[PDB]
Design a protein around this ligand. Structure first.
Ligand SMILES: Nc1ncnc2c1ncn2[C@@H]1O[C@H](COP(=O)(O)OP(=O)(O)O)[C@@H](O)[C@H]1O
Ligand SMILES: [Mg+2]
Length: 354
């Protein structure tokens, strides 16, 4: 499947919230198939079809079992991937990625469920396959990278080499040998995020959070070893900045519009246009770090979080369309994992009989 490596887009509608409900908000979204929805409102109207659409009744386990679980199998097999949670503030990005509390069984989101599955597979693997797992947790705000596991470092640099790709130099990576150790890592990172949001004059809705899991596996009988990494991204709010509606700071720092949550849109536009191979990954550190996830070597899933309320019809339409544009993007289908071959040949040479 060299072309079936398209970006998966799933839409998730949460129930209306208090402000919508008590402001005269009404449902404007109807569901057709398990992959289609229809909006009918003053500033909406339209029919959209994605790889999957979850209605207001769908629970956390549904999200995971119907569109995320397959991703864990990919990383466990040496493939790289990324899962994005996109949408306006209050749409359900964090709830979907981390959940209300990772300690509330029903309310826990994608990430903790991914970790459980990873350790469950590892533990049931043949003694012949030895695994290693390590995590990183960072936050990007105003184009500055903060290590949520080593908070003092709040301006980490981004580096890049031909023989390695893009990485954050100095980012702490912690080996974890159990579901419990990783869970505490998630709690620590959450704590660090609240600290920044509370004491650093930083808008929590305008920062991106990235959880990185890297799994290495070695077949001790063949001496062959490979790895796969998964980036779990909770993006900043996608609503229009307008520098007029939330008490804007200095008009300069209002470079918010230029930020990654804009660089992401420009990157998506360029890829869907396809007339130029010069995609603007550099417009932001987010898009540089995740450049392979957009048009490169990666199994990518985009979760667009939407409100089903007429109160937020305009933003929900903007989000759906964005999701529609990302849908037509095809990712690079090269470099599998273990030798079998994982395809039909995978030996790009030329001839060289000698
Ligand atoms: N699908 C859902 N079901 C029930 N409550 C939800 C759901 N999705 C989101 N919420 C609630 O949404 C409110 C704000 O959502 P949040 O996930 O913080 O989203 P965002 O990060 O996109 O701002 C929270 O109090 C959250 O628990
Ligand atoms: Mg959030």
């Amino acid at each position: 499947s060299s072309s079936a490596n398209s970006i998966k887009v799933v839409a998730r509608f949460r129930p209306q919230n208090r402000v919508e409900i008590e402001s005269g908000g009404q449902p404007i979204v109807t569901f057709q198939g398990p992959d289609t929805c229809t909006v009918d409102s003053k500033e909406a109207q339209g029919s959209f079809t994605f790889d999957r659409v979850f209605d207001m009744s769908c629970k956390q386990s549904d999200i995971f079992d119907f569109s995320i679980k397959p991703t864990v199998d990919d990383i466990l097999n040496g493939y790289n991937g990324t899962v994005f949670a996109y949408g306006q503030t209050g749409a359900g990005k964090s709830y979907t990625m981390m959940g209300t509390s990772i300690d509330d069984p029903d309310g826990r989101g994608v990430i903790p469920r991914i970790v459980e599955q990873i350790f469950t597979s590892i533990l049931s693997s043949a003694a012949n396959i030895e695994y290693t797992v390590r995590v990183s947790y960072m936050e990007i705000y105003m184009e500055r990278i903060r290590d949520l596991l080593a908070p003092q470092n709040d301006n980490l640099p981004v580096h890049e080499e031909k023989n390695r790709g893009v990485y954050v130099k100095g980012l702490l990576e912690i080996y974890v040998s159990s579901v419990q150790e990783v869970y505490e890592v998630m709690r620590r990172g959450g704590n660090a995020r609240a600290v920044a949001a509370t004491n650093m004059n930083q808008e929590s809705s305008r920062s991106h959070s990235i959880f990185v899991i890297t799994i290495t596996q070695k077949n001790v009988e063949t001496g062959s070893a490979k790895s796969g990494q998964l980036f779990l991204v909770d993006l900043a709010g996608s609503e229009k900045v307008g520098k007029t509606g939330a008490s804007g700071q200095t008009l300069e720092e209002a470079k918010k519009i230029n930020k990654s949550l804009s660089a992401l849109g420009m990157v998506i536009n360029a890829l869907t246009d396809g007339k130029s191979s010069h995609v603007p990954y550099r417009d932001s550190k987010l898009t540089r770090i995740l450049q392979e996830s957009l048009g490169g070597n990666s199994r990518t899933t985009l979760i667009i979080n939407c409100s089903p309320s007429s109160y937020n019809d305009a933003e929900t339409l903007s989000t759906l369309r964005f999701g529609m544009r990302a849908k037509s993007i095809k990712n690079k289908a090269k470099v599998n994992a273990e030798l079998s071959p994982a395809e039909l040949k995978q030996m790009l040479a030329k001839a060289k009989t000698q």
